[PDB]
Amino acid sequence: QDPFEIAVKQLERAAQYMDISEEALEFLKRPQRIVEVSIPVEMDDGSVKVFTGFRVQYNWARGPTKGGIRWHPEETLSTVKALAAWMTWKTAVMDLPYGGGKGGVICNPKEMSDREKERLARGYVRAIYDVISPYTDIPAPDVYTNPQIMAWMMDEYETISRRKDPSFGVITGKPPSVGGIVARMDATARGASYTVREAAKALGMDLKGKTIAIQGYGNAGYYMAKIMSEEYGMKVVAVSDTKGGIYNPDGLNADEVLAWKKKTGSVKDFPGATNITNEELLELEVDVLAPSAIEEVITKKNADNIKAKIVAELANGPTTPEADEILYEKGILIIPDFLCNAGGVTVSYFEWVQNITGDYWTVEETRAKLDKKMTKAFWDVYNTHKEKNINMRDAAYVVAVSRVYQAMKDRGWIKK
């Protein structure tokens, strides 16, 4: 289905950049396992309503599959399969010991009691219990799920598993009271702060003094802002939200802007600052550009106007194939999302290790370990893009895919 169909293509295109049997391609083109279940839920009004959820375990050749759970009224399998495939390249490029998986339920949390959300989380686990474990498949939070939901879900598992395993490790995005971890607050942006630093290096450029413009002012946007300016000494001249951007040559203060938005509801009309549009933002003359909100914000239409040296993809899919070629030719360094925003998944892996080892780390320890991980994944991609003459996004899928190809071979899943 379209969403999946798009995924395969992504894949089918990268092969061309590498040596890989067809036995392989054929395998890597369908998910290893799909589970589809009916979850009867008792609604507040005493009525029992049946939902439909999925869990897809795409490929586990490299490790147990990692992947979040989504709650969404317009959810579909294809979507789930497609996103499962994706995690797969994600974990691989990051070189973690996991395969990729993903789940979803077709429901409207927005019309749900806290108590009806608890019973759906429980029903999910009761339904797909037989394919999850701390060593088989480890979920986590996605669209419309959060730590609270994770905990109810861990809790129902222990009740079934009866504690004969490291129960806290069957799922991540947990609240700290139960094996969850801090450091997970800034992960994505923080992780993203490390590629950029590296990216700078590549271009033999020093960040201090440089400029950044961030589209979107949420967690990522908020944190990416605080960090780049605080730790890297960059100038945050532009930030933006759902309602407009505000520009300032002298550099904004994330905490201040944050307060305004939190009291005013928007970053817009922030005193001392000029109001601007979002498209305006994309087209600024800044060193780094961090699209951290929505997708397809950079297209053939605008691709031509982007004046950033580095385009940091914190959100998923801001850029388009078309926009891809132009920015390449144009000479702009792009940190594909799935490499740029992978500190999320990385930390999650850091959480699992702590749950299974029973040993808890300090934030510092945890940040150090995150840096290393990102630091390598980048160079790994960059160097490949150079050598093979392909953009970072193509480079990235080549790094990813081969890793899965090898493992599949070593196990003898395919002979060649």
Contacts (CB under 8 A) with a second copy, residues 375-404: 403
Binding region for a second copy (CB under 8 A) out of 212-220, 296-304, 388-396, 406-414: 406-414
The Cα-based distances of 379 to 95, 189, 339, 387, 395 in angstroms read 13, 18, 11, 12, 11
Measured distance CA(369)–CA(363) in Å, rounded: 10
Structure tokens at 73: 């009224």
Structure tokens at 152: 């109810």
Least Cα distance to 6 among 375, 320, 386 occurs for 320
The shares of helix, strand and coil residues in the chain, as percent rounded to the nearest 5, are: 50, 15, 35
Contact track, a second copy, 225-264, x by CB under 8 A: ----------------------------------------
The pairing of strands 244-247 and 235-241 is antiparallel
Contact track, a second copy, 64-103, x by CB under 8 A: x--------------------------------x------
Q: Does 148 bind a second copy (CB under 8 A)?
A: yes
Q: Does 48 bind a second copy (CB under 8 A)?
A: yes
Binding region for a second copy (CB under 8 A) out of 151-159, 188-196, 312-320, 325-333: 151-159
Least Cβ distance, residue 10 to a second copy (angstroms): 19
Q: What are phi and psi of 176, to 5 degrees?
A: -55, -30
Options 285, 364, 387, 410; binder of a second copy; rule CB under 8 A: 410
Structure tokens at 43: 């609604």
Least Cβ distance, residue 390 to a second copy (angstroms): 23
Annotated binding residue at 238?
Answer: no
Measured distance CA(172)–CA(184) in Å, rounded: 10
Binding region for a second copy (CB under 8 A) out of 43-51, 187-195, 252-260, 393-401: 43-51
Q: Does 300 bind a second copy (CB under 8 A)?
A: no
Annotated binding residue at 317?
Answer: no
Options 5, 9, 108, 115; binder of a second copy; rule CB under 8 A: 115
Contacts (CB under 8 A) with a second copy, residues 175-204: 175, 177-179
Options 34, 326, 332, 390; binder of a second copy; rule CB under 8 A: 34
The 8-class DSSP code of residue 131 comes to: G
Q: Does 4 bind a second copy (CB under 8 A)?
A: no
Options 8, 17, 33, 242; binder of a second copy; rule CB under 8 A: 33
Structure tokens at 299: 């297209």
Q: Say which of 102, 117, 210, 373 is annotated catalytic.
A: 102
Binding region for a second copy (CB under 8 A) out of 186-194, 322-330, 351-359, 380-388: 351-359
Annotated binding residue at 225?
Answer: no
Residue 409 is a catalytic residue: no
Polymer length in residues for the chain: 416
> CB of 24 within 8 A of CB of 80?
no
> CB of 153 within 8 A of CB of 122?
yes
- Name 54's bridge partners: 36, 104
Residue (393 or 403) nearer to a second copy, CB: 403
Measured distance CA(222)–CA(218) in Å, rounded: 5
DSSP 263-325: HHSSSTT-TTSEEE-HHHHHTS--SEEEE-S-SS-B-HHHHTT---SEEE--SS--B-HHHHH
Q: Does 168 bind a second copy (CB under 8 A)?
A: yes
Residue count, binding to a second copy (CB under 8 A) = 74
**CB-CB neighbours of 259 under 10 Å:** 12
Residue with tokens 């370990």: 369
Least Cβ distance, residue 83 to a second copy (angstroms): 17
Contacts (CB under 8 A) with a second copy, residues 120-139: 126-127, 129-131, 133, 135-136
Looking at the annotation, which residues are catalytic? Answer: 102
Q: Residues comprising the binding site?
A: 216-222
